[PDB]
Amino acid sequence: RLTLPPSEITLL
Amino acid sequence: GPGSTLVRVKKSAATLGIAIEGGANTRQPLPRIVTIQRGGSAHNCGQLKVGHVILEVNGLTLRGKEHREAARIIAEAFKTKDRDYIDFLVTEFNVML
């Protein structure tokens, strides 16, 4: 449970 | 900025117990946590997760640091006797540039 989901936000 | 969290990790174990990937001039320009090992300081803290991208270590930016330099900064931050924690500024966002 120490895992993030795929993020739906990206920094460019 | 939006999406960042400052996480203070107590040096509760003999290692940080994370693997990181990335750094300047790679497809992952800021280091990403790829594993959190049971028994390490990071696992004990509960606030760091696989997929976190590390933006700053003790207030020092990792932008522009090559992978080996970023890793060395983190290692030196763990080893130091000046304090009993490491501050990580992390984001859950992907960082692609």
Side-chain angles (χ1 to χ4, degrees), chain B residues 6-26 28-37 39-97:
Chain B
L6 190 59
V7 176
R8 178 168 289 186
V9 178
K10 185 206 191 329
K11 300 171 184 188
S12 57
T15 67
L16 196 46
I18 66 181
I20 58 162
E21 185 175 16
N25 322 117
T26 71
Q28 176 73 55
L30 286 162
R32 176 188 128 98
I33 300 177
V34 295
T35 312
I36 291 177
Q37 302 176 335
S41 296
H43 187 95
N44 291 340
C45 161
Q47 292 158 267
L48 283 186
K49 300 192 182 54
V50 171
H52 267 145
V53 170
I54 304 172
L55 309 174
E56 303 182 357
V57 173
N58 290 337
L60 179 54
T61 186
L62 297 188
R63 179 161 290 282
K65 303 308 180 64
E66 186 270 334
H67 177 81
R68 296 170 289 198
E69 171 64 330
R72 186 228 78 197
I73 287 159
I74 292 166
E76 294 318 302
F78 188 80
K79 290 167 179 270
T80 187
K81 281 181 197 172
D82 291 355
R83 66 198 70 84
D84 74 343
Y85 60 91
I86 307 176
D87 279 344
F88 294 99
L89 185 70
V90 300
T91 182
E92 294 181 11
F93 302 172
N94 313 286
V95 182
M96 287 188 66
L97 284 177

Side-chain angles (χ1 to χ4, degrees), chain A residues 2-4 7 9-12, chain B residues 49-52 92-94 96-97:
Chain A
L2 290 189
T3 57
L4 302 179
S7 184
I9 301 173
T10 298
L11 286 159
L12 300 157
Chain B
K49 300 192 182 54
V50 171
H52 267 145
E92 294 181 11
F93 302 172
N94 313 286
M96 287 188 66
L97 284 177

